[PDB]
């Protein structure tokens, strides 16, 4: 087992960073990199979304993402969708370390459960992109036997519309390319993975509560060596097993056990982390012009 | 990724098992099991326990065996547990296959998910069990700071009686020992895992749907050369990954693709599947005498 990292804090993930050993970082994001931008996440109790659909009467709040239930009863999907549609929000601090570390020649990749399309809007690139959990940007029927693609505009004109999207060729339900529970992730999803994991160096782990499969699986095929850093308002991963947990069996952070060897938990708001870790690498001012700078780019367009 | 079968067929499976290699099996089953002798499934439609609870007025079917529900409404799970008290039933011929499998000095472990005992009525001891999801046989007081134990009888008469199990100490409520979603699994669960896997030559998977952790991430702890058999009634543990699915990336089985080299799928009757078995070992008019023997016996007590 190399032991990677010097300590089991930031300052150590900091020095790792600089050291050439650390050539290419995965980051692993979800809703909790979005919230500082005004977008709720899904779990946090009271501000989360499945804290707040109490209107659409479901079975339950993961209803209205399931692919089961979305075809008995579209309506509330559709209802919702309204706004979930992105560009009255802009990029955080934390969106914007990660695109430091693509200019750094340092980001192998950046898989992100979120649709709000922030990490395009702060410039990471297609290429540098796994976008886990699918995009907003197309659609498609639902028939398997179909599948008629359908663009932004004609989803958009019938959300708006208050048309319930059916399918031109089978009259089955139309849907945004969004990842329901039950639907299969995107190809690219699978193929990236599958050479990503074999060579990263450093895993940063970023506004997720790892409450969801496959995704939450990506922490266990990194290499045993490979240091992972967690940034986020609560410990995740971490746990001890039960009936139902979402992790496999030992597949999870360990931070605090006496075996404890390269998980490290920094506790705070994401860009907070983000801000700290820059500051300890010398990026600090480069990160903040950025962040002014982009936020300006926007304002003006 | 070494290939022992020398076919992914019963016929392989069953040569490997006469191979010298061939010296420590381990049996991983759910409720499949114990369907033929009269006991529902869980998931089955229209049959399984699951789509049969519609009285109790839950809101989703599993919260009749979750914790947080249990403690605030704990009337429809004793409700419901009068059915669940092991006793009218005979094993299987799946169970004897076991049994067989321990006279016949291959049997490592069979881990169980079930809770209806007849692994130990056909003859499993207590050292060739885990009883992965509990037992009824012994039932506890749910608050973490007491833990008094009762009784199987103290629990039947509390049970029949339809008094709602107090504990006499502390007044929390007592809880058969039944693992329910939300709680930690029994001890003796993880210290024969942790053993079990490290040379276990086969896994034989037999009537579970694999649609709970973390049992389901067993048959990932066996080496990757360690054949698995599944006998079942339909594919379990084979899927395309999905959003929600249960089983971590990749620690599925793979029967079908071209990569696949040591799962092999037999698919219809538990009980069919092991005479098959057992013929092709030339056991099979062992296993049906003691079947019928005890079956005997136990008609007579
Ligand atoms: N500003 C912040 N800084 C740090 N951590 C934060 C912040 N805000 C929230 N958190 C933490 O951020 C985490 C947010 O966790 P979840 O809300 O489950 O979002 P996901 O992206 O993991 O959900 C994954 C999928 O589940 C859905 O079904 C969809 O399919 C999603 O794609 C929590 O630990 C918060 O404490
Ligand atoms: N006679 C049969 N022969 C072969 N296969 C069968 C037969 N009967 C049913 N099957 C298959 O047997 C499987 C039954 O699957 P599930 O009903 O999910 O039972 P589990 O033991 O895996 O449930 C695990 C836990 O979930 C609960 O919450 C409790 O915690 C349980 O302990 C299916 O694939 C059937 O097609
Ligand atoms: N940031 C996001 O992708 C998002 C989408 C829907 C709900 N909450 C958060
Ligand atoms: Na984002
Ligand atoms: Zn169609
Ligand atoms: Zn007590």
Redesign the interface.
Known sequence: MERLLDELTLEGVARYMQSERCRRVICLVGAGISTSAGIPDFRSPSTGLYDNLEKYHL??PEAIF?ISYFKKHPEPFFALAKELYPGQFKPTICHYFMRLLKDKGLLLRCYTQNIDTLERIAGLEQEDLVEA?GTFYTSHCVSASCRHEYPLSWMKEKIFSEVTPKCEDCQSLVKPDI???????PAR??SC?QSDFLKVDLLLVMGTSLQ???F???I??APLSTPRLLINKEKAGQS????????????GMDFDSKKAYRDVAWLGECDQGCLALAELLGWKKELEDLVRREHASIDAQ
């Open positions: 079975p339950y399931e959990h990842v329901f529970f039950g639907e299969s992730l999803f699978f993975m969801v499969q496959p939450a699986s990506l266990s095929k001890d097993p039960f009936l139902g947990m979402i992790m496999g069996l030992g597949g």
